[PDB]
Amino acid sequence: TMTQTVHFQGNPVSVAGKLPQIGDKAKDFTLVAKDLSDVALSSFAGKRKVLNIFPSIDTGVSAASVRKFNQLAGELENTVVLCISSDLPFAQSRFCGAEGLSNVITLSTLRGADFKQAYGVAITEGPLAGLTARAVVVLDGQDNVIYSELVNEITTEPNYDAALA
Amino acid sequence: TMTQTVHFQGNPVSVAGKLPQIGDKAKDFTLVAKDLSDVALSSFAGKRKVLNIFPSIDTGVSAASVRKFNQLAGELENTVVLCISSDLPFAQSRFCGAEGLSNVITLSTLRGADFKQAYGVAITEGPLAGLTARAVVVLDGQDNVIYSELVNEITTEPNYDAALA
């Protein structure tokens, strides 16, 4: 079993598996949409993917990342932004409905919990155990990894400008 | 494996296990609190428990039940109301913080997913799969079941007045 290390403020927390690095082929996942429908990664074939992985959408830092990726989604070409978290579809829907975000597509780990182990983002120990770590993974049309970032510390935002290819 | 049957509007959905009926001894569970601390059922020993189990706190019907149980919690004697759902602690905290509910204690199935199987409330199939069914379980000081209700249909509220002993 592979082990990664991130932190909250300054507290080492173990992450199961490893984030798919450059050149690797990302595993096909199936997650719950806003209308409780199972949406797979294979449905976005031919289109570029930006996977925004965060602990919870109700937290302060992660709420800013969804709003940021929503605004730059209109600037992107042939790209769909997929906000993935441990939140339920209802918690993700009430946020996007109140903030007026329509460009992003929310995905829930309610069904498809194996996503955490396949992408190496599952938090093993601590108070954040069971949640997903802060990560940004950029994919092409054929699910090949072009960009992948595992943010060393949870409180700081991932790099949005470097995610561009 | 035992199988129970409830529905959404009029669509039969299978529930794994069975709700602990009258006379049975309820299993000890450990769930996540609002401050990300693991709180067990053994911590409320000597006190009477009212377990409010619902799919999601962001849904319309379940939001009314939490508000109802919060108002009658001040009327109850030696009783703690535990709102249990598949929601994250952050989604439960933002609701109670905005509505001004303080009498209820929110518990998350983020850690302690075995609660669903032990109490027989896990939804097996359909769009609501992975979530908890609508149930109200009343316990005494020694975790013995005094009242238990599995609401036949999700959209209708559980009986609050009959839950009193």
Numbering used by the authors:
A (entry chain A), B (entry chain A): 0 to 164
What did the original publication write about this model?
As part of this study, the structure of ypTpxC61S was solved to a resolution of 2.55 Å in space group P64. This structure represents the “forced” reduced form of the protein, as the resolving cysteine has been mutated to a serine, rendering it catalytically inactive. The C61S mutant Tpx is present only in its reduced form and cannot undergo the intramolecular disulphide bond formation critical for the catalytic cycle of the protein. All of our solution data indicate that the mutant structure and the reduced wild type structure are identical, and that the oligomeric states are the same. When superimposed onto the reduced structure, the r.m.s.d. was 0.52 Å over 163 Cα. This fits well with the structural analysis of Hall et al. who used the TpxC61S mutant from E. coli to describe the structure of reduced Tpx. The dimer interfaces are identical in the structures of reduced Tpx and C61S. For ypTpx C61S is 2.80 S, suggesting that this mutation does not induce structural instability (i.e. the value is comparable with those determined for reduced and oxidised ypTpx). In comparison, the purified C61S mutant was present only as a monomer of 21 kDa. This difference can be attributed to the changes in the strength of the dimer interface, arising from the loss of two salt bridges in the ‘forced’ reduced C61S mutant, which in turn is more susceptible to the heat and detergent experienced during the far-western blotting procedure.
